[PDB]
Amino acid sequence: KETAAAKFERQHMDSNYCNQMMKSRNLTKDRCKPVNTFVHESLADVQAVCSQKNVACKNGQTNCYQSYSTMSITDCRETGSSKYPNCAYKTTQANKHIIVACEGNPYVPVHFDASV
């Protein structure tokens, strides 16, 4: 069973698209997840953000880090009409800075806090 770091990778890493990938990565096989972001950068370059700019997370904890550069991301957002089993997503591609919460040793991303 998955570690938090493994779950982050299955849910967000990817070095219509959103309906296909959300199903493939087991996000919408048994529920419709409202939002999810996929990052199209190498895993090592996303893991490298845990030593970049320290910032407060949305919740006030301080183990969040913002990437110095923008990264290629796809945002998947459920339509207003979506209902399990027929989940449906609006796909938006963008190049944005990512903010991840990091934990562990090695200190690696375990939550996607935001893109900016």
Swiss-Prot record:
Lineage, top ranks: Eukaryota, Metazoa, Chordata, Craniata, Vertebrata
Location(s), subcellular: Secreted
Highest taxon, organism lineage: Eukaryota
One example GO MF annotation: lyase activity
Tissue expr: Pancreas.
Enzyme class: lyase
GO biological process entries: defense response to Gram-positive bacterium
Positions in coiled-coil regions: none
Positions bearing carbohydrate: K1, K7, N26, K29, K33
Bridged cysteine pairs (disulfide): C18-C76, C32-C87, C50-C102, C57-C64
Designated gene of the protein: RNASE1
UniProt subunit comment: Interacts with and forms tight 1:1 complexes with RNH1. Dimerization of two such complexes may occur. Interaction with RNH1 inhibits this protein. Monomer.
Known role: Endonuclease that catalyzes the cleavage of RNA on the 3' side of pyrimidine nucleotides. Acts on single-stranded and double-stranded RNA.
Catalytic center residues: H12, H111
Catalytic reaction annotation: an [RNA] containing cytidine + H2O = an [RNA]-3'-cytidine-3'-phosphate + a 5'-hydroxy-ribonucleotide-3'-[RNA]; an [RNA] containing uridine + H2O = an [RNA]-3'-uridine-3'-phosphate + a 5'-hydroxy-ribonucleotide-3'-[RNA]
Record-stated family: Belongs to the pancreatic ribonuclease family.
Keywords: Disulfide bond, Endonuclease, Glycation, Glycoprotein, Hydrolase, Lyase, Nuclease, Secreted, Signal
Residues where substrate binds: K7, R10, K33, P34, V35, N36, T37, K58, R77
E.C. designation(s): 4.6.1.18
Example of a GO cellular component annotation carried by this entry: extracellular region
Name by which UniProt lists this protein: Ribonuclease pancreatic
